[model samples]
Each structure stands twice: as C-alpha cells, then as structure tokens.
Target: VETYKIYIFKVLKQVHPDIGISSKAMGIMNSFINDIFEKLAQESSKLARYNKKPTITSREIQTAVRLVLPGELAKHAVSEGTKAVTKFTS
Candidate 1:
C-alpha cells in the first residue's frame, strides 16, 4: 500500500508538476495502473508460454500493449516503449 501510494504520487508528479492528488484519486490511479500492469504481465507471459520461451521479450510487451490499448494509443505506447528500451539498452 505504501509502495503503491508512492508510485501513484510519482506518476501524478510526472503527469502534472504543480498539481497535487488526493488520497482517493491516488487510490484510483493506483488501481488503474495495477490493473493495466497485471493485464500486460498476464498477456505477455501467456505469449511467452505459447511460444515455448522462458522469457518475455519486448515484442511480447508490444503485443500486449496492442491488445490492451486502443489503436492509436497502442501505437504511441509501443513506439514510446520501444524507443525507451532502445535508448536504455544502447
């Protein structure tokens, strides 16, 4: 719970600089993030299992994002995710 609150606080800070979030809003945001991440992890792991791989790759994440997000949003998310991973790895 503390970790989720911190995570939500950081996310709120990132999304808005001067703005502050209420505890209720923080709970909502945390739940949303948790649900989405859970979905992504489940779907990506399923993909890995289907492929008979021990690891989930970026491709699996992209596919999971595409499955979860709407078309244009998924495109943007995948693009940003790919760019970030590439930048981090390189």
Candidate 2:
C-alpha cells in the first residue's frame, strides 16, 4: 500500500506539478491521501458497526477524491487511477 501510494504521488507530481507545485505541497500530497482515506476509514467503521459489509473499493476512493479535492486535473487523475486499481484488484 505504501509503495502504491508513493507511486501515485510521483505520478501526480509528474502530471500536475502546478497545483501542489512547491516542496511543501510535495510533502503534504501524501497527507492528502491519508486524510481522504482516513475519512473513508471512519465511514467503513460506521458501516461495520451496523453489521454492513463495507463496499470500500477503489472506486469509492475515487468518488471520495472527486468529492473532496479542489483541483480539476489532479482529481481526474485520481479518478482514473482509482478505476485502474479497481480493475486490477477486482
């Protein structure tokens, strides 16, 4: 998971270096991932508490990314990446 995330940040850095363009942005990009996933983690917890099998797939992550992220192209990349991961995993 860690390797996969690092690869993602590298891809993001390559594609849209204009948004999170600075070194500080580079440092916090992974935190963006962790922050989004943390919300998903809480959501998963709620579902699990209700005895529901959480459908926390990569697509869900993409949706979360789309919903939360402020940038345009970066969000699209995240959406596409999520779809790709979902296809590979499922």
Candidate 3:
C-alpha cells in the first residue's frame, strides 16, 4: 500500500506553518514518497536475504539507507528514522 496522503498533508502543514498545499504538489510528494519507500524496501530485502534472515529488521533498513542514500542525506534520514522507530516502539 502507498503512504497515506492525509499524513503527508499534515506533514506539509507542519513544515509550512500557515501555507497551503496544492494538489499538484501533493501528487509529486506522494509519488516521491512511494519511490523512496520502494528503494529502501528493496535494499532492506537484500540485506535480510544476504544474511539468510527471515525478517527485515530496523537494522537492515538502517544499513539499507546507508547503502542507498548519499552521505548527508543518509545521515539525516537514518537519524530521523531511528528516532521515529524508537518513538513508535516506546
């Protein structure tokens, strides 16, 4: 399934404060999110399979992020990703 658009709408609102988001811009973000998610999932799957593990853990995704994204982007993403996962599991 795709990431929920409503959550992205809320994210835009949070980032932009008083600004309004357009449907065209929404379309771009939704698709962009999907592709990024797919890339991470694909790489995570590889990590799991290479280790012969049945499950893809957060560690796999973190490593996948390191593998797929460039230095600064990967660093930022993994930090946020780790925080979010920790928050969710908390």
Candidate 4:
C-alpha cells in the first residue's frame, strides 16, 4: 500500500498543510484519511461482489481521493492522472 501511504501525505500536504499547528488538526486529518480509505475499500468490495474480481481501478482511486480531500490540489492531480489516457493505435 505504498501508493496509498504516499497519497495520504500527498493529500494531507495538498489539502491541509496547516495541520502542524495542532495535534487536534493532525488527528482530524488522520481520521479523514482512514475514513476515506474505508469507503474506498467498501466500494471495492461491493464492486467485487458483482464482478467476482476484487480490483482497484485508478478511477475508483480518484473517486476516493476527491471525496476525502474535496478542495485539495491533490484531488485534481488524481483526477487528472486517472483520466489521462493516450491511445497510440487507431
């Protein structure tokens, strides 16, 4: 889950860089991170239920990122990265 770990800080820095001001703020940020990942896990399980494949897609990750860090620059970055696809064959 290194990607998730990296994005946790990525999102925190992008959304709430002012969090070093207080323990309470850091706690809240941590809570949000857990909650977001839980939601993603739930959705992933549900998708697996219907499809028989427990897969985590980039779009799914983007959804979770947007929900957890709504106003953050990281959300935009995830969305951009997820939706960016290049087709070299016609």
Candidate 5:
C-alpha cells in the first residue's frame, strides 16, 4: 500500500514483462506477500524461543523455512536465505 507497491510492481514486471496488473490484483498480491512474511516471522520466532534465544537469527529463519516449506521449495528457500546472508556478511 506504500513503498512496497513499487517493489511489488518491479517483481510483477520481472515475472511478466508484457502484462499489466490491476489495482485490485496489486492489493491482493501485497496482502498475500505480507501474510506470507508474517507467517514466516511467527514460525521463526517460535524456533528462536524453542532454542532459548532472545533474538531471531537468520539461521532460525532458514531452519523454520526448511521445516515449514515442502520438498524443493524448502531447499531453494534455505539456499536463497544462505546466499543473502553471505552476501550481506561478505
């Protein structure tokens, strides 16, 4: 609904360069993305709690994603998460 709209537009363009999304569709997609990240955050938070940690680290997210996501998607998620972490640290 705010600056995220720009990011969503950029992602949509990357996925479907020739197509245009309606305002309603954009709203839906925004909500969907927010919902997904919220779920991930909650799950990762639980993982942190289970580990008796005060902070939710990237490793917790990677493990939570692996636990929550299925099949190849989980592998891809962990791979991408680790890639991002390495990119940030190095």
Candidate 6:
C-alpha cells in the first residue's frame, strides 16, 4: 500500500531540514517503506498463525521486526513501535 507522501516528506525534513530530494529518491524511500511494511505483515501473520492466535499484538510485531529487520535497526524500530502502541492504546 502507498503511504502519504506528505508524511514521508515531513520525516525527511525532520532528519535533513535543508535537503531537497529528487522524485527518484522519493520513490526509493516509498518502496523501501512498503517493502519493510509488507515483511512485517508477513512475519507477524506467521507468528500469529504459529501460536494459533486470532489476533496480532504488539508483541508479535516486536518479534517479527527482529526477524525481518537488521539487528540495530530492529531495536530502533521496535522501540518506536512500542512507544507508538503504548501511547495510542492508553
């Protein structure tokens, strides 16, 4: 699924306020996000199925991210994911 371009650009600016991105760069980032997102879905679903669970929780995603993403990257992503889930659920 495609994400919001505005949101994407907003994040880009957060890390590099003075930088300008080309269309190709934007597309690269978009595909990267979707690819990672798809993997998370695939891994998370497999975890749920393995446990005979009907619902997927943040724990599933936390574990799935570890399997799907790189080591330190997974840590950062999981931390952010956990924070988002905590803040939103409460």
Candidate 5 all-Cα RMSD: 2.1
Candidate order by decreasing TM-score: 3, 6, 1, 5, 4, 2
In order of listing, the candidates' clash counts read 0, 0, 0, 0, 0, 0
Model 6, runs deviating above 4 Å: none
Clashes of 3: 0
Selected candidate, larger lDDT, 2 vs 3 = 3
- Residue-wise C-alpha lDDT for candidate 6, range 1-90, written one tens digit per residue: 787567789998999999989988888888888898899999999999999999998889899999988999999998999899989989
Tens digit per residue, CA lDDT, model 1, 1-90: 224778677766898979998888877887887888898999999889988999898999999999889999999999999999999999
Q: Distance (Å) between predicted and true CA of 88, model 6?
A: 2.0
**TM-score of every model versus the real structure:** 0.86, 0.46, 0.89, 0.49, 0.82, 0.88
The Cα local distance difference test for each model comes to 0.87, 0.63, 0.90, 0.61, 0.84, 0.90
How far off is residue 61 in model 3, in Å?
Answer: 0.7
User: What TM-score, to 2 decimals, does candidate 6 have?
Assistant: 0.88
Tens-digit per-residue lDDT, 1-90, candidate 5:
233677999987899999999999888888877776877888998888888999988888888887778969999988988999899999
Model 5 misplaced stretches (Cα beyond 4 Å): 1-3
Using TM-score as the yardstick, the better of models 4 and 6 is 6
lDDT of 3 by residue, 1-90 (tens): 586589898887789879987888888888988898999999999899998999998999999999999999999999999999999999
Q: Can you give the lDDT of residue 1 in candidate 5?
A: 21
Candidate 4 wrong stretches, greater than 4 Å: 1-19, 59-90
- Candidate 2 C-alpha lDDT tens digits along 10-90: 787799876545656655766766776677566555555555555666545555555556679656769678778879989
- Candidates ranked, most accurate by lDDT first: 3, 6, 1, 5, 2, 4
lDDT of 1: 0.87
Which residue runs of candidate 1 sit more than 4 Å off their true CA positions? none
Residue 90 local lDDT, model 3: 100
